[PDB]
Symmetry: C2
């Protein structure tokens, strides 16, 4: 046994933050650079594809959409899980 005094009321992003700030500074740095480079890649791709306006619309078609908000919310979770798996990996 053990003393049960947090399954209910959980926040995925807060754990991602704890893990990023408590893991080896070498690993958290590498993971953060990975995410930064991916972002730069995605941004640059949208531009070369000249979908910049397309994306601004899409990003602006989110406030009113619903299945899409829930969607990027699930994507954030996947990213956090990949993040944590990489830090665990290395």
């Amino acid at each position: 046994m053990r003393d049960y005094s947090e399954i209910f009321e959980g926040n995925p992003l807060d754990k991602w933050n704890d893990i990023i700030f408590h893991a080896s500074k070498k690993l958290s740095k590498k993971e953060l650079e990975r995410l930064l480079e991916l972002l730069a890649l995605l941004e640059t791709f949208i531009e070369k594809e000249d979908l910049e306006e397309k994306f601004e619309s899409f990003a602006k078609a989110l406030r009113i959409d619903e299945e899409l908000q829930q969607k990027i919310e699930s994507r954030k979770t996947d990213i956090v899980i990949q993040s944590m798996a990489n830090i665990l990996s290395g």
Copy 2:
């Protein structure tokens, strides 16, 4: 005056890391969540636009391209600057 004993040989990403890990944990957390949500947005957009293959090609057309590598490298710098400006802002 002052003692001059780092203009030459500088690394943009190392400063971004110092700033992320030395700033208020409240501000670095907010900035990191911003980047994570943007990434989730960009990923989700590429998918709804069904450009997933298009992006994998593009991301794979980088190893051989050159003006594009230098390009995402400049984009990383812009992102780091925006990052630092937000932490300074709030």
